[PDB]
Every structure is written in C-alpha cells, then in structure tokens.
C-alpha cells in the first residue's frame, strides 16, 4: 500500500510539521514524503530506527519514496528544522520491538514533545 506524508511551512499543530506526524503501515508498504512547502527533507533521527533498518537522508526539496523494510517504529526528522520540532514517527507493522527503546531517544525539547504525542497516537 502506498501513504503520503506532507511536509509543511504550517499546519494544525503549529510551525515546521510533517502531516501525519504519526502513521502505521505494513512492512513493505511505501510512503512518500512530499514537499508541499519548499526548505524541507526527511531523515531518520538517531537512536529511532529499528535492527536490520537502514538510516536515510533525502535532499531538500525532493519528492522522496521509501519503501519501508524492517518491522518498527521509525523515528523521522525534517534536518533544518529538527530543533522547531519537525519530526514524525512512522510505525511498521504490528508489535514492534524497538518501541520502548524509541522513547528512550533523546532529541531537542520541541521535537521531544512532538515525538512523544506522536508515539502515545499509536497506542504509546
Ligand atoms: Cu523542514
């Protein structure tokens, strides 16, 4: 199944936010993150992506398709504007195992808030 996750300048939730900022999919599933708003990318935040993943960093402004693999939760960032927040959590699959250790993960206080609404979305 294919998901879309937009990246914007401003949304519900305040400045610099991905929508969603929390999705489930299923392992294999795919989602794009596109650049509604210019300025913006995604890249997998430290300590917040499961065994077996591989990290990523796309470019600013490209339309960046990621078939995810590994079962987890999968913890996201836009890089400029990590420390405003801009950050999201992509859960792959049912039960993942690196939960706990993703509330673990230390970042910037705005995304910490962020990142901890978006965990509790999903069931905590
Ligand atoms: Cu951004």
């Known amino acids: 199944a294919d998901f879309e996750v937009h990246m914007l300048n401003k949304g519900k939730d305040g400045a610099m936010v991905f929508e969603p900022a929390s999705l489930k999919v299923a392992p294999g599933d795919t989602v794009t993150f596109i650049p509604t708003d210019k300025g913006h990318n995604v890249e997998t935040i ?41 950050v999201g959590v992509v ?22 808030e962020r990142l901890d609404a978006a965990l509790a979305a999903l069931g905590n």
């Not at 470019?59 to 913890?75: C, H």
């Open 91 to 112: 859960q792959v699959g049912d039960a993942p195992a690196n939960l706990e250790a993703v509330k673990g993960a230390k970042n910037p206080k705005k995304a910490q």
């Open 46 to 86: 430290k300590g917040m992506i499961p065994d077996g993943a591989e990290a990523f960093k796309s470019k600013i402004n490209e339309n960046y398709k990621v078939t995810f693999t590994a079962p987890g939760v999968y913890g996201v960032k836009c890089t400029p504007h990590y420390g405003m927040g801009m």
